[PDB]
Write a protein that binds this ligand. Structure first.
Ligand code: CL
Ligand code: NA
Lengths: 105, 105
């Protein structure tokens, strides 16, 4: 079956953040976002999907709507469709997120 | 912004596995499954939804289709639509899973 150790899949790119697909689903994106310090997924609105950022490792500043919060390990932030959202690693350490998007964009 | 510390949401039902919705998304179920030893999510089939189990804490024996594997902490298992799936906490410790089902069944 498709069963993986998420952290072991994480690959950080010095040039820019990386999105590492965990599973290939026709109904969602179940990815890892590997952000080195200073890297980020720019804030954007995706009207066709809901996204949930879950911090697996490290921390990122997650923005949903007009709010930002520190998404520390173990925390999940919900970015429902229409809400501008993004994550930025402002820390001095890598940050790894489990990012789920439904439906598949 | 809806941001939650997943572990802090865990609650256990002694009579049966506790299903604790993390977020109410129209696009997916993003739930926590709190399984005390011996508890389980009986085998189920979502003809039109994919489900991904991610072991936040503890371990469960995850069944997806014709296979069963130990879903240890940090591991995620993918149950594509149609595949019978379930999780059983056969350990002597509680298990907490982040379970995503998309779309909502
Ligand atoms: Cl993909
Ligand atoms: Na069913």
């Amino acid at each position: 079956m498709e069963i993986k150790d998420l952290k072991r899949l994480a690959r950080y790119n010095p040039e820019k953040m990386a999105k590492i697909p965990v599973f290939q689903s026709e109904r969602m994106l179940y990815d890892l976002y590997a952000l080195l310090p200073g890297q980020a997924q720019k804030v954007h609105v995706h009207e066709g999907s809901d996204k949930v950022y879950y911090a697996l490792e490290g921390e990122v500043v997650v923005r949903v709507g007009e709010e930002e919060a520190l998404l520390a390990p173990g925390m999940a932030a919900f970015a429902p469709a229409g809400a501008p959202h993004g994550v930025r690693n402002e820390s001095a350490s890598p940050a790894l997120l489990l990012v789920v998007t439904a439906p598949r964009p």
